[PDB]
Design a protein around this ligand. Sequence first.
Ligand SMILES: CCCCCCCCCCCCCCCCCC(=O)OC[C@H](COP(=O)([O-])OCC(O)COP(=O)([O-])OC[C@@H](COC(=O)CCCCCCCCCCCCCCCCC)OC(=O)CCCCCCCCCCCCCCCCC)OC(=O)CCCCCCCCCCCCCCCCC
Ligand SMILES: CCCCCCCCCCCCCCCCCC(=O)OC[C@H](COP(=O)([O-])OC[C@H](O)COP(=O)([O-])OC[C@H](COC(=O)CCCCCCCCCCCCCCCCC)OC(=O)CCCCCCCCCCCCCCCCC)OC(=O)CCCCCCCCCCCCCCCCC
Ligand SMILES: CCCCCCCCCCCCCCCCCC(=O)OC[C@H](COP(=O)([O-])OCC[N+](C)(C)C)OC(=O)CCCCCCCCCCCCCCCCC
Ligand SMILES: CCCCCCCCCCCCCCCCCC(=O)OC[C@H](COP(=O)([O-])OCC[N+](C)(C)C)OC(=O)CCCCCCCCCCCCCCCCC
Ligand SMILES: CCCCCCCCCCCCCCCCCC(=O)OC[C@H](COP(=O)([O-])OCC[N+](C)(C)C)OC(=O)CCCCCCCCCCCCCCCCC
Ligand SMILES: CCCCCCCCCCCCCCCCCC(=O)OC[C@H](COP(=O)(O)OCCN)OC(=O)CCCCCCCCCCCCCCCCC
Lengths: 63, 459, 171, 331, 65, 93, 120, 50, 19, 100
Amino acid sequence: DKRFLKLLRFYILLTGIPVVIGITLINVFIGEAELAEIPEGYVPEHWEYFKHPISRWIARTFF
Amino acid sequence: MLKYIIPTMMLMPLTWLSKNSMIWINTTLHSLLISLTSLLLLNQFGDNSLNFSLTFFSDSLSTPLLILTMWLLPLMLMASQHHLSKENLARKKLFISMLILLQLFLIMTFTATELIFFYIMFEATLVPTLIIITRWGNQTERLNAGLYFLFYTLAGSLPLLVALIYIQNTMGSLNFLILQYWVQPMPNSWSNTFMWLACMMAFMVKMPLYGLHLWLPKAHVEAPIAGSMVLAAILLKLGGYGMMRITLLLNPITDFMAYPFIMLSLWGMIMTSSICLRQTDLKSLIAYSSVSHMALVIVAILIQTPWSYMGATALMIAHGLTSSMLFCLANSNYERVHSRTMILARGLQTLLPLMAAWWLLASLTNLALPPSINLIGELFVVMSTFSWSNITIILMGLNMVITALYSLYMLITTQRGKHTHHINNILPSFTRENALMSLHMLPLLLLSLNPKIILGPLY
Amino acid sequence: SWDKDVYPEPPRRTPAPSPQTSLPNPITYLTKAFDLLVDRPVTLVREFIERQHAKNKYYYYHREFRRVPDITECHEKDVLCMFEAEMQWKRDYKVDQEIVNIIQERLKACQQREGESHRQNCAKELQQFTQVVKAYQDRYHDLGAHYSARKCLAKQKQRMLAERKATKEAA
Amino acid sequence: MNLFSSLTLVTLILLTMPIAAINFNTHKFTNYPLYVKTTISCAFITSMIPTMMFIHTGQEMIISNWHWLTIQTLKLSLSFKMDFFSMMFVPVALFVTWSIMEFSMWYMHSDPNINQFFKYLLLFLITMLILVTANNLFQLFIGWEGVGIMSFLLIGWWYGRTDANTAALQAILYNRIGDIGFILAMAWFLINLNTWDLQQIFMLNPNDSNLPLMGLILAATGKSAQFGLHPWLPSAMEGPTPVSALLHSSTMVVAGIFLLIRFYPLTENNKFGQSIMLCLGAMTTLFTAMCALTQNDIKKIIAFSTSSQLGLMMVTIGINQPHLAFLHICT
Amino acid sequence: LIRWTCARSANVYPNFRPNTKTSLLGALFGIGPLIFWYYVFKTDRDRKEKLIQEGKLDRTFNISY
Amino acid sequence: ITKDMLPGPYPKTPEERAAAAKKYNMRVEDYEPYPDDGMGYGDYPKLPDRSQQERDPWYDWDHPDLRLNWGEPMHWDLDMYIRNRVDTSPTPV
Amino acid sequence: MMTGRQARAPLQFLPDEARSLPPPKLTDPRLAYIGFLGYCSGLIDNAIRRRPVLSAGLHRQFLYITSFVFVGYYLLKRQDYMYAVRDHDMFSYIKSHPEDFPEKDKKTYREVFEEFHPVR
Amino acid sequence: RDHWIHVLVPVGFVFGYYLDRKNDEKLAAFRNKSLLYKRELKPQEEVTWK
Amino acid sequence: ARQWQPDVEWAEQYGGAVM
Amino acid sequence: LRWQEDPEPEDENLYEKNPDSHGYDKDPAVDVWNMRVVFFFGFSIVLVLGSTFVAYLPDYRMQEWARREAERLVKYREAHGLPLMESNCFDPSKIQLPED
Ligand SMILES: CCCCCCCCCCCCCCCCCC(=O)OC[C@H](COP(=O)([O-])OCC(O)COP(=O)([O-])OC[C@@H](COC(=O)CCCCCCCCCCCCCCCCC)OC(=O)CCCCCCCCCCCCCCCCC)OC(=O)CCCCCCCCCCCCCCCCC
Ligand SMILES: CCCCCCCCCCCCCCCCCC(=O)OC[C@H](COP(=O)([O-])OC[C@H](O)COP(=O)([O-])OC[C@H](COC(=O)CCCCCCCCCCCCCCCCC)OC(=O)CCCCCCCCCCCCCCCCC)OC(=O)CCCCCCCCCCCCCCCCC
Ligand SMILES: CCCCCCCCCCCCCCCCCC(=O)OC[C@H](COP(=O)([O-])OCC[N+](C)(C)C)OC(=O)CCCCCCCCCCCCCCCCC
Ligand SMILES: CCCCCCCCCCCCCCCCCC(=O)OC[C@H](COP(=O)([O-])OCC[N+](C)(C)C)OC(=O)CCCCCCCCCCCCCCCCC
Ligand SMILES: CCCCCCCCCCCCCCCCCC(=O)OC[C@H](COP(=O)([O-])OCC[N+](C)(C)C)OC(=O)CCCCCCCCCCCCCCCCC
Ligand SMILES: CCCCCCCCCCCCCCCCCC(=O)OC[C@H](COP(=O)(O)OCCN)OC(=O)CCCCCCCCCCCCCCCCC
């Protein structure tokens, strides 16, 4: 049971810690977007309609 | 949806070309890759459903059932290999192929654009299930269990088939995208009454209905573990998903014809719960619990309010994960005591403490401990049925006493008290078994954090 | 930030501290302790984060769903126009739902910040809430879980029949 | 504003940290009961600051810090409500739980599962301070079922004893009978007011609210062991004496009375509900104190005593005095 | 134990004879409560529908259903 | 397990009743099955219909939380008459 | 059904006006399904005669695949021909008889009165 | 390749992904023809979506 | 404890002239 | 002895010959690599990165957007004296009622 608990916490933290560090390095350095009015004649792509950079990356790549 | 059917079909040369010890590892690895891939269907919109082609679309209703189905294959492959270690390599590949084939039929049952393709896949899911139950089952009564499962369902569905062809001759098409827009109000006659019965009774059988549920406690205790997982978690939810598709066409005759089946389900969720009080057979107790929970899904679909549909889909997802974990806990006893009698093996907290904690978590989520989405689904169903009629809360609340009383008794009998003296093969919990419990329960505990992905087409 | 008008607030009128007792009250000293030890380091961390944010400016846009022909000018059993009508109505349905949510937030915050005198001082927010719930009940209530623009138009035609009968029976 | 809400949430997050400490261990702990006792000591010291800055000003607020769900008109937000009741009960609950843990370091020293016991007691404290700080009926139902299930897991502590498990099953049976009325109350408020938040319930001010008050009286009867649904509190002494001393005397059993004191803007406008609460409280405080006259097990006598005081709490709610009742809880 | 589980589960219908006693128990226990709850909920919903269709039921704030 | 130890239908002749008493491991005078009224029992014995709480606890049983031996014919409602459920032990009044 | 159509020209598998249609490609997915059936016929032919399932009879599997694709191509041509004949007869009959096929005046939803049946 | 069996299902998903993106070309009959998402085309951009 | 497969007693049901 | 038969085998303990077994396979290298496959592609792929993917969904069914639109449109009808919601959804000038 202790071996299962140690392996469970290890294989969760294996991408728990670096991806939380990546969320930190995106939210501090890249930066959350700011609301703006729509200009004249400018038509964005569909991923430029969302707030967080990770949602924008998902909407550009996967969707 | 052809990016999910092609890898599921590619899992057949992935399981027939693998080496003699690799046939679990390759299928588990690639099926987990498919399950992580399956989150791409969260591109849903508040007005439009995610619509792929003339053959497949996937709304916000079919999407959580798809993620659950493509997640349920690796859990079945983990759960169903300790009792198949001495089995021959060819039939082991056949068992893995039948599980992959059943996943292949399920993932294009839920994404069916046109409803006769929904019918063909909806009755195509019988065949690998039937082969699993009658071939890789464990006891004598599985062969009888291959008939009661089969000839009930077809006895509703071959009229249902006829009904769908009538719509193909009357509305002009069986597309769900068309029949959101060409649906006509169905008046009162005996013709439209048997139209309603032909549309609904096959799904009543596969919910199951109280009275037509006789196949279910025999098809769960006689299947193997992967069979019991896939009959509890998905194959009872084909009926709920199909009713949510098919009650679009059945207004307003459902507003006065659905009353006896509402009464059947609102009293069956009391009677099968009282049956869950008095089961010597643990896997029978979990099967009657599945009946006692799906009765509220029948009620929430027939009263057809938004709180009821969101509660019904949340309870379908949450009860799928809960009942799959409960049958795997029954397997984790039965692989060590070799009997499904619940009164045999008592006092397992003195022997398996972390497994007893998993028994505790599944026994608390079975009685809908908030803020788990068991309680979200149960709660919204009870709210909508108080909106339907103000006395029904009694039959809800009384049920929410007895839903505790078999969830805790199974917690008290199998875990608490004096241990058994003549049993000394209670082995420690394998990493397979605890990984199995974690992959059952921890997605259900993470969906408490963000339930808005499993709340139907009308969130 | 937000918009101050759609989420209205009365002007903050705090009273002055009137020290009468000779013991120094611990709130001013705990306030200065939280001010020196916690408030200013969190200020410096937030301004460091702000200086990191300002180097790469970009924007999203609030998507405009422009108006299309609704269900009343669509030919019967024509899906190419009533699809647009149905998507327009479902987006307007979500918008009316969030308007009712905004009115609920106004009413609850009025009841909290008007304290014990909440029964009198929140009559305007209660009147706005009662009117918008009567409008939402006459617009979208009792449709069904398979709701559509056909259902909403059928309800609206039934209610206009009842209003025309009410006009005719008293004239 | 920056102080009150901050140390308020710091109280609850400080409580939730040793659960993360006990779940994420590899080694055997160097004196984990001292760790959790020092945690709840500093949680009392922390939560005394919002109490003082409420006693001076009279500053009540609401921390709706995380909107969690939107069911088409109803906003389920992670919303805490700091009013008179939380500000006077959270120091009492934390202080009594701190005394019970420093008693449990003496009583449960023979247990090798002492760390599991302090984990469970902290989990009960977290769910109880979710119950008393909830802004709405769903989060109050979260705290309700949390303290009910911890009543199960701490009555049935010595799980090899059959009577302990039977008394725990009894306690959950009576609690779910209370949950019938509480879910009836949530159903009535959703259907007839479109809310679970207490602000909108108090603002709309229903007057034909006989049925939801019958539901809340059934909830209080299930939780605070009133007559008809009382005997689980007699049988609930089969758990450990720190469990009885904390839960079933000071912290758990005053939750249904807390639910009734919470709804004083509705129970102030009903005469029949007050008469029902008055007769039920007199019935409870007669029957339990009469049963306590001839007994010989001391834990049974003190449990009948606290159920008699719960009957007295029900009486003083029934006389339109919720604040004397809450003063009586914190006393 | 195997004998008791066999007598409780797998030897119930092969020990059955449909007579007047078991028929008047099975009909009184199976369809009796269903017909009773049918009358109860049908009477209550007819009363509720008659109140709603005239506006005699106070349905001022009811917008979540 | 083999079929001649498993339960059968309700017996008619006294030699069938005696062979079934030989099956269930209990004496012949004490062998009482449930009466043939068609409820679905069969030849299962009707044990004296009290709780396991009335069992003398100082005896060294094989299953002490059940207070029940090995091979002894269990009651039809055995999960009902355990100490976790309905107690039929005698009361003073 | 069409016994008055295929009676002036009997035993024609593909008529002259069957070539006025686009023929199926070699990459037709129905033809690829028939080729999959040919490979499965090769696999079952190996398996029932106790041969290696992947190794034995590469000429045998190759002619099973080629034979099913070669028959399936002309079956798909006849299939597409007969459905084109069905739609051609339908459209010529709709053109010839206007009084049996009126242009339906689709009145918009502002005039269509559908009775509202509420759910409660 | 020494691990040729671990590239059936990823290449299978590439194949299904390409068939779905290619099937989205054949259902492009209303590519920039809806009564909502209609607009003037930006320069050096001949389709609105692929 | 192992899987049940049919024996001679079960298989003599399928051996007569009729079923 | 009717239907001559193998003796029934033992319910084998994997921990006798292999006390480092996880329970997947009796050959230990294949067993521990199956453990690594389960934990890596089950937790370090699907739960953590998948929960990150579900965590930052781009506005699942417009629950953000419909709020923000409302925070404009109430502004569009708090200023200019319009009511916050009509009792009519569709325009009553373009509805043809059936005459009586
Ligand atoms: C955290 C690591 C822990 C260890 C790792 C392992 C953890 C386990 C495995 C996890 C595996 C991954 C799981 C999936 C994660 C997915 C991400 C996610 O969930 O995001 C959600 C959400 C999404 O955020 P986002 O969209 O990415 O960005 C937000 C803004 O857009 C943008 O905001 P921003 O840009 O302004 O901020 C960005 C942020 C970076 O972004 C983040 O950190 C956000 C992402 C973190 C997610 C972590 C999730 C894991 C679980 C954490 C919680 C449980 C831990 C265990 C239990 C602990 C006890 C409870 O920057 C900072 O952190 C810097 C500021 C630090 C302030 C504090 C210190 C200030 C003073 C310092 C003084 C000293 C220096 C002075 C001099 C300095 C000179 C320069 O993130 C969060 O909610 C953050 C988590 C913490 C929230 C507050 C927690 C306390 C709340 C209390 C009240 C409510 C509860 C009350 C309970 C009452 C009792 C019941
Ligand atoms: C997206 C980012 C999110 C970040 C935050 C994470 C969110 C939660 C994720 C899931 C966490 C559950 C972990 C513990 C339970 C499962 C394993 C277990 O049995 O542990 C016992 C064991 C501790 O026992 P032990 O003494 O060390 O050894 C075993 C004992 O011999 C035998 O043990 P025992 O018998 O003494 O212990 C039984 C005891 C029994 O205790 C209880 O039953 C009492 C507590 C639960 C009932 C009452 C409370 C009800 C809920 C109210 C409070 C929560 C909500 C409050 C919200 C604010 C106010 C409204 O259980 C516990 O103390 C478990 C504490 C956590 C319980 C959670 C609720 C389960 C109840 C059923 C569902 C309830 C509704 C849903 C709640 C969802 C919450 C998110 O835990 C561990 O050793 C830890 C194992 C590794 C855990 C990994 C967790 C993460 C998995 C997902 C990874 C990927 C996602 C990224 C997140 C990563 C975060 C690290
Ligand atoms: C699981 C077991 C129970 C399953 C129950 C299934 C539902 C019960 C009733 C099924 C009836 C058969 C399907 C009806 C389909 C109706 C389609 C339709 O449009 O009907 C309108 C049509 C109406 O006729 P019409 O549409 O041609 O009318 C001409 C048009 N007007 C009205 C303008 C004049 O209905 C029928 O023609 C007959 C319908 C009833 C059929 C009765 C025979 C079947 C008997 C019951 C079989 C039940 C299942 C059998 C298996 C049980 C186990 C062995
Ligand atoms: C101990 C280490 C801690 C972390 C150390 C490092 C980080 C230091 C601090 C900086 C953090 C980053 C910035 C602040 C965090 C993000 C702020 C923010 O706006 O985030 C977006 C939001 C805030 O809400 P929102 O309204 O902006 O978005 C919600 C999302 N929608 C609207 C789409 C539904 O989320 C959070 O802040 C998450 C906080 C979670 C805390 C509570 C967890 C409860 C767990 C149980 C769940 C079940 C409850 C169910 C019942 C609920 C009530 C009915
Ligand atoms: C889904 C249907 C099929 C089922 C099977 C699924 C198979 C695949 C499985 C993949 C993983 C599961 C998929 C769904 C994932 C859902 C989780 C998720 O994404 O959450 C996102 C949510 C996001 O929150 P949100 O919804 O508010 O989003 C905020 C909005 N953004 C991010 C855009 C700014 O994550 C959280 O809520 C995390 C909050 C911070 C971390 C936790 C802090 C508190 C921790 C506990 C403190 C103590 C509490 C009390 C404890 C007492 C004792 C118990
Ligand atoms: C404000 C309004 C107030 C109204 C008050 C009046 C009305 C309600 C009155 C109460 C009715 C229900 C409660 C009574 C039954 C309690 C059952 C129970 O748990 O009993 C305890 C019993 C063993 O405990 P005990 O006898 O103390 O042990 C001594 C050791 N030798 O435990 C056991 O034997 C375990 C048994 C397990 C199986 C239980 C079977 C019965 C389940 C009953 C469900 C009741 C649901 C009610 C729904 C109502 C809906 C409106």
